[PDB]
């Protein structure tokens, strides 16, 4: 709820994303939702988080992914690559 509130309200957005990654680490569907959120948004700490997520990475999850789009792993990898590129540019 706090994360959603922060989202509704740049640094705040980053803090929310960090909180989300932390929650995902503590916990498949959740991970997918997180990836979707990251893609929509599209430094060192952020990269570390993205990495941990990649390391962590069924039918219900696929359905959720399909609903969001309206392959997933590939899109996730692409997003991660983009983030890495952004970090390198910074």
């Amino acid at each position: 709820p706090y994360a959603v509130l922060s989202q509704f309200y740049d640094r705040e957005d980053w803090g929310q994303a960090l909180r989300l990654l932390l929650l995902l680490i503590e916990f498949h569907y959740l991970v997918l939702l997180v990836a979707k959120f990251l893609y929509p948004i599209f430094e060192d700490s952020v990269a570390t988080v993205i990495e941990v997520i990649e390391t962590k990475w069924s039918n219900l999850y696929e359905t959720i992914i399909e609903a969001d789009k309206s392959a997933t792993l590939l899109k996730n990898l692409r997003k991660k690559l983009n983030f890495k590129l952004c970090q390198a540019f910074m």
């Binding site: 706090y2 909180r19 932390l22 929650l23």
Partner: peptide, 8 residues
């Protein structure tokens, strides 16, 4: 408090 329980 709420943000300390989320970090845990």
């Amino acid at each position: 408090d709420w943000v300390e329980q989320l970090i845990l």
